[PDB]
Each structure stands twice: as C-alpha cells, then as structure tokens.
C-alpha cells in the first residue's frame, strides 16, 4: 500500500502495533495529524517530515510539488490513545511513500525514534513490540541497531517467526520498507 | 442546496444514537469548520472523512481542486448534545460527497462505521444501542461495518426483523447504497 | 443599516427576550460574535451564517458577499451570560435582514434551533420563553413545529394574547418575520 | 485631549474612573486593546468599533479606516483589572475622537453600555461612579437614560456640582462629549 | 540593531536591576517578546511601541519603520518570572535607541509606567528598586515624578548616593538616558 | 556535523548532555521547536534566532533566510523533558552552522544563556554539566565567563581532562565551535 506502514509503538492497551496511514492530496503545504496522538508522537511526525524534506533531492520530491500538497497522517483506530517516539521511522517511511507513490512492502513492521540527522535511536519495550508483531503475523521487523542487545531476553519461538533487521539510518529503513529504491538513481556496473 | 445530509448512528451523552450529519459546501477558500458539541475523536473523524473525498475526488466526479474554491461546514445536531467517537465517519464521507455532487442521499438509510484514509470501514462499539435508535427512529435500511456482523446475534429479533442491515467493507459500497443517483 | 431581531433563548437567569443585533458593513469576511456567548450559542451563529451562505442566491444576496463583508453579531446585555441553541432562527433572520436590507417585523419574537438543511428543531423551556414574550408585549411568536405539544401547559390568557406560529423550516421563518417579500 | 476620554466603569478596586487612551496611526488595520481588560470590556470595544464603522460616513471618517489605520486602546493603570460593559460609550467616543482629530471636552466623563444600534443601556453602581467623577473634578457626566431613577438614592452633595445628562443614543453622547460637531 | 537599558522592575526574586533589550532587525512588522514576561509586562511593551510610533517623525525615526522592521523585546535572565508595568519607560528608551542608533548611558537606571500619551505614572516597590540600583553601582536613576514622596521612607544613606531625576513625560527620559540628544 | 551541537542543560532525570539538532530547508519562514522543550528553553531559541538575524550579513547568511527557510530545532531524546536557558549559545551555534553549512566541531560541548546583544550569561549546575562532558568523552567545553568561580569547587579529575574556555560573547563561541572561521 502507498502511504500505509505498520509501526510498533505505545498505545493504552500496551506497546501494541499501529496502522499508520497517510494521504498527499492537492493543497497548499499544510500538515495535519490525527488519531488520538500524544504530544511526543506528534513531534515525531514533525521530525519525520523535516527528515524527508531535508532529503528531497535524493528522494526525488520536488519542493514545487511539495508546497502544492497537503499531508494528512492518520492513525486508526481513531479513539485509541497512542504516544511516544517509537513510530518515528514508520512516519518517515509513510511520508516518503505518500509523496512519491512508492508502495510499502507487504509484511514489514518497524520501530525506532528518528532524529533530524537520519539516525535511528533505540526504543523501549522491544519485548511487547515484537510480541505484537508476532501476534499480527508480521514477517519482517526493522528495529534500531542499538536495540540488538534486547533480543537476547525474547523467547526464541517469537524470534523464529520474525526476520529482524537491525538498522542504523533512515536510508536503510527506506530501502528495506519501500518496493522501489527510494534514494538516488540506479547505476549498473560490470567488472 | 449546497448542503448534504445523512442519518448517522453515533455516540451521544444522552445514550449514543440517531443523528443527522450535515455538511455544507458553499463558495469559499478552503476553510473547514465543525460544530455540534463534538468531542475530539469525532472532530478528527471529520478530518479523516474530508481527506477520503479529497484523495478520491476524480473517481467521485468532483473537481480535484474543489477545496480551494469551497468552505466546508460539518454540523451535527442536536446542537447542545455532547457527542463523540468515530462512528459517524462513513456518514460524514457520504454527506460530503452528496454536498459536492448534488446527488441526494436516501432518507430511509442510516449508517454507522469508522472510516479510514484508505476508504475502509472499521467496526464500532455499542451496535445494540445504535440499531435500537435506528429502529425507534423508523429507519428502513442500516449500513454497518462488516466486522460488526458477529454483533448482530445479540440484537433483539424484532429489531433484526424491522431493519434491512447491509454490512459494508468499503466506502465504495456505502456510496452506491446511500446515494440516490450513483 | 443594522439587523435587529427579538429571540427567546437561555440566559444565566433563565429563558428570556434577547435583542439580537447584526452589522454587515463592507469588509473582507471577518465574523465576530459578542455578548457573553457560550460555545453552543456561538455554534448556532456559525450554523445560521452557513444557512444564509447556502441560500445566498435564492435570497437575492451576491453569493460572494462573505468575501466583501465583515459581520458582527452582538447580543446585549453585554455582561449577561447567554447560551444554548434557541436563538438560531433569530440569528439567521437577523443575518438575512442585515445582508438584504429587508427590515424585521415589529412585534415578532422567535425561538428555535436551526440546522444547516434549514429544519427548525424544538427547544426547551417554552413556557418561560412565552411568558417573557407576553410580559414584554410581543404580539407574534414563531416556535418550532415540534413544540406544539408544549402549548397545552401554557396559561390560557398567554395563549390567547399571543399569535403563535409553529414553523418547520427556515423559509417560513423568513417569510413571517421579514417585512418584505422573502 | 484627542482620543483621551474619562470613562466610569468597574475596576477590581471599585467603580473608580477610567482614563481611556487611543492611538490610530496608518497601518494594516491592527486592533490592540490593553490595560488588564476583562472579556466583557474587550467585547464593549468591539461593539463600539462596529458602531463607528457602521456610521463612518456620517461621522466624517473614511470607511476604509478598518484597513488603513492601526488602532490601540489602552487603559492605564496597566496592572489594574477592569471589566464590564459600562465604558462602551466612552470607547465609542474615544475612537471617533481619535479617528477625526476632534478633542474631547475637559471635565466630561461618561458611563453607559453601547449597542450596535446606538442605544445606551443602563449600568450598575452609579453612586460609586458619580463619586469617582466628583473626586476627579469632573463637572459634566453622561449617563444612560435608564439610570435617571437611580439618581434618587444618591445624596445631594455628591451630585450638586455635577452636570448630569441622561442620554438615550450615541449621537447625543458624541454631541455632548466632543469639541466640534461630529 | 539591539537597544539596551537598565530598568528596575518586579521579578520573582523582587523588583531588581534588569537589562531590557530590544532588537529591530529588518523585517515585515512582527513583534516578539520573551523573558518569562507576565501579561502586564507584555502589555507595557505594546504601550511603549505605540508611544514610539506616535512620535516617530520627531525622534528622527523613519515613518513606516513598523512595515520594515521586526521588533524583539527580551528581558534576561530568561528563567526569572517578571511582570508589572514598571519597565515601560525603559522599553520605550530601548526601542528609540534600537531604531536610531543612539546608545543608552550605562550609568542610568530607570523605572516607570508609560501611557500612550507619553506620561510617566508612579510605580510600587521604590525602596527595593533603588536599593538594587545602588548595589548595582548605578549613579543616576530616573523615577516617576509622583514617586518623590516615596523617597522619604528609603534610608537617607542610599538616597544621598543617587542622582535622582523625577520625570513626568517620556521626552525628559529620552534626554537624560540617551547619549546623544535625540 | 552541520546543524548539530553538543549542549549541557537541564533534564528531567539529571544527566545533562544534550544533542541539539537543526534543519533549515527551503520554505516560507516556519519555525518549529520539538524534543519536549519547556517554555524557557523555547524562548532561548527565539533569542538565539534574533542574534543570528542581527548578525546575518557578517556571518555570510542571506538576511532573507527568515522568510525563505523553514527552521526546525529538535533535541532528542524526544520523550525526555528539557528546559531552562542554558542551551542558548548552543542553539545559536546550531543555527549559524545550518544556515552557512559550516560543520560544528564534534569535540566541543557548551553551556551558556544567550542575550540579544550576544553576551553569554552564567548558568547553574556546572559541576553536573562538566561531569557529563568528562564521562562522555568531550575535549573542549565553552562556559560563561561568570561561571569561572564555580570551577573552584569542582573535583580536579573531572576538570583536569577538559579544555575549558570561559566566554563572554557569541563571536568567541562561534570561532571556537565551528570548523571554518565564521
């Protein structure tokens, strides 16, 4: 799906999984975000968007086009309170996909705090996040490189059904989550 | 006549029930306003409904730039009744499509369901009380989310007898069923 | 010019007579509303303006008047809290009068909740309102159609002194309350 | 004396007197009101300003002043909370004076609530206001006509050196308060 | 493009020595204020600005400086809550200094509330303020004319060491505080 | 590298090493501050921002940047509350870096309240801030000149390892923090 990403982050009912949605429609450069989102999660969307815009050239988003779009990120179920920083890289991925028409890869989830520099910072509650992904039949989860330590204390039955890809930067997350290569143009070389 | 109207079933502090969702779309400059003693969740459902229409504007027969040329006012009477939740979403989407196209809505049809940006219809809570309101209100046909079908067993036989309940998965089905012309 | 209508609506000390004032001078589209107005009454003014906007051409108003008018709705006494939806039809009438220069009738008061579609919904406290009109020497009162039931309990002399007209729709209100044609 | 008017209105310390000040310099139509003003007094300013706009042509003011002048109302002492509607006719007078160069008259004070139609409505605590006028060497006081009967329960000596003019309409206030025929 | 004055005004610590800063960088008329300022102090900034604007021609400031400058008034220490009207004459001084390039004499501190007419009104806590100027090594202090009596209850040993200039109007403050005659 | 500064400031636990980020992409002047920042810290960003504007020309910065760029200051970790004025010089450094493309030295940490005139004011918690820098591998720390006295009671081993540069003004800060001469 274009603009749809599965994040793992905190909701009232524990650190469940989140179905993030995004729309990029004819407009005037307005950003709106909804889904009973707490302050910290809101700010993660703002950080995620700035990350995209700072990388517009590499990702092929023209500023002309971007200022003629409104963006709405919505996170159903609408009434469920969600919060925290851990959907950061999912917001970013969703927004790149939304702006470029680049479909998100099926059966991937991701968790991690985004920074303006593109670094994926570690999150809390990896146990229950991975539990939620397993429960949902997710096949591949992207997690912060720096949470690799936390995999040890997770039951090996859940670990077995999940393909875990620890990531350090947003460029890697995008290559792992989107169908087409989001950064640059493709050069073929032969030896 | 730039005002769409649709019978919704949604939560109210006087026991969540039958409401008319209204949506006007007069000449303007792309301002959204919403009224009716709405809680935050319901307010956000209006945003989501709008976005569904804006994204599907061509497939729906609406000018894709309609939003620069129109003001949108969504109102949910009765005006003093505190109301909330996502269950009016598909009614808001329908009202807005009606308002912009001139296609009237069937007054004998009511609807309940959370809408997503992807045009899917998600399940709601308190289906009993919703369907009770549709029954008491003399509504003929109710659209409910497909995932609320299992909830239909707890509904009293006489309400199931009275009401033609059509479960829906997508906004497409909603519009086909609720709008008079297409 | 200055639009001026007598409504019956809730104040801190109960339902009472309110002088609703409107000014609509050349401008850029600003809406201001004052009078120690609670949020519900504020929303009723928004609803009333939308009704007018949606009927602009039928009413003979340039449909882009909102681009070139500022509108100030004010409800004295300034210090007295007021609230609820029952001035809706008065607000609409005041707006129409001001924007068309069609003066409001002498000795008419009105109570009733407006909706964007133009249906007039019933209000509470009709007895207190009708008593206030009667004490104030008002000759004609427009009430919502679904308040006909509340007339039984009104003192007989009050019913006899007042000309009471139940209305279903805003068009009826404008025809009865405005001095000229519409 | 231009744009400077003595109002009589409520302050947190009493019904004290108010030195209302105004500035109106070329700009984009900014409106600023300061002086620890409560919501009701702020609302009286908006009412006063709409009355001026509605009458701009008859008062010698260019009606585009809303877009060509920045207006600042300020009521020292800055930290003293002030509120209520009773400075309404003082605000209207201040604004007219500021916008036409017409100085207010020495030793005049005024109290009265303003309506959009220009009627002056009665106020409370008249005795305290007249006392503040007396202690302030005010020789002429404008008051609402409906406060005439309140002059009875005020004593002989706190009035005998005050020239009290009960007024019904804003025109009368402006004629009495300003130096040149408005 | 940064003016600097030492004021004496109320802080959460007490009415102390305070560096009031103002920048006036090229721009399009935005006003920015920071320094943990309470609402009364913010309003004193608005009065100060209006005073400078009303007198721009006299002072040698280009008219329409408010079209072409952004103004930022900051009062360190950033975390210390401050409030009241007493920095008013210091804000005026800083703004005139920023706009004209006329440096402020660092041997001068000042306190006083400013009115739109340029009058200086008396302030509170004179004792604390003059003690903090003395402790701070300030030679000269400007105070409201009406605060003269208050000197009599401040230790004579402190007051003997201060060159105190009681002032009625903003012109007197600008002549005393600005290095070059404005 | 560019638009990235290591600060020492206040934090809900008490550690104090802060990773300050900035971006300044093409836009229309929007300003966004995130990272759970308290109001005093946000004001320090506004102060820092005006410092850059005042000096834009000297720093090679296009003075149009304030309406031509969108500036985002973010301080992870996103969830951790942060406040106080002690990141002011860091915020200024981060902003200058971003707008010039001049990389910040990764071996430098800093702490210091900033003023509109560019002076660096003393902060609190020096002992805890320096211990954070000692533990965290930083080689050079910029501290306000007036905190020199606080080094006396900090343990020798935490300071023996650090190159501590006490600074009075932002110009020093920028020379020592940035890779290429500002």
Protein architecture, described:
The structure is a homohexamer. In chain A, the strands form 3 sheets. In chain A, strands 4-5-3-1-7-10-11 form a 7-stranded mixed beta sheet. Chain A has helices spanning 39-54, 56-59, 63-67, 88-100, 126-135, 156-161, 170-177, and strands at residues 5-8, 10-11, 17-26, 31-34, 69-74, 82-83, 108-110, 113-114, 120-121, 140-144, 163-167. The termini of chain A are far apart. With 191 residues, chain A is of the alpha/beta class. Chain A has one domain: Ribosomal Protein S5, domain 2, CATH 3.30.230.
Compact summary:
Six copies of one chain form a homohexamer. Chain A has helices at residues 39-54, 56-59, 63-67, 88-100, 126-135, 156-161, 170-177; strands at 5-8, 10-11, 17-26, 31-34, 69-74, 82-83, 108-110, 113-114, 120-121, 140-144, 163-167. The first copy, chain A, is α/β, with parallel strands linked by helices and 191 residues long.
Write down the overall geometry of chain A: globular
CATH level-3 fold name of chain A:
Ribosomal Protein S5, domain 2
CA radius of gyration of chain A is 16 Å
The oligomeric state is homohexamer
Number of contiguous helices of chain A: 7
Instruction: Identify the CATH architecture of chain A.
Output: 2-Layer Sandwich
Note the gap between the termini of chain A: 37 Å
Strand order of the largest sheet of chain A: 4-5-3-1-7-10-11
Give the largest interface pair and sizes.
Answer: A-B, 21 and 23 residues
Strand count, sense and barrel status of the largest sheet of chain A are:
7 strands, mixed
Q: How many DSSP E strands of chain A?
A: 11
Q: Which secondary-structure class do the elements of chain A indicate? A: alpha/beta
What is the string of SSEs of chain A from the N terminus onward?
EEEEHHHEEHEEEHEHEH
Percentage of residues assigned to helices of chain A? 25-40%
Family (chains C, D, E, F): Belongs to the peptidase S16 family.
Domain Lon proteolytic (chains C, D, E, F): 1-180
Subunit structure (chains C, D, E, F): Homohexamer. Organized in a ring with a central cavity. ATP binding and hydrolysis do not affect the oligomeric state of the enzyme.
Protein name (chains C, D, E, F): Lon protease
């Amino acid at each position: 799906r274009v603009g749809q990403v599965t994040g793992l982050a905190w909701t009232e009912v524990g650190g469940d999984l989140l179905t993030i949605e995004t729309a990029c429609v004819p407009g005037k450069g307005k950003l709106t975000y909804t889904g009973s989102l707490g302050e910290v999660m809101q700010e993660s969307i703002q950080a995620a968007l700035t990350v995209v815009r700072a990388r517009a050239e590499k990702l092929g988003i023209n500023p002309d086009f971007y200022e003629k779009r409104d963006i709405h990120v919505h996170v159903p179920e609408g009434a469920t309170p969600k919060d925290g920083p851990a959907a950061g890289i999912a917001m970013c991925t969703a927004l790149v996909s939304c702006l470029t028409g680049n479909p998100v890869r099926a059966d991937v989830a991701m968790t991690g705090e985004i920074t303006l520099r593109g670094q994926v910072l570690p999150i809390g509650g990896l146990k229950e996040k991975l539990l939620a992904a397993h429960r949902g039949g997710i096949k591949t989860v992207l997690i912060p490189f720096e949470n690799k330590r936390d995999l040890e204390e997770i039951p090996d039955n859940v670990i077995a059904d999940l393909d875990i890809h620890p990531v350090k930067r947003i460029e890697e997350v995008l290559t792992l989550a989107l169908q087409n290569e989001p950064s640059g143009m493709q050069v073929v070389t032969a030896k």
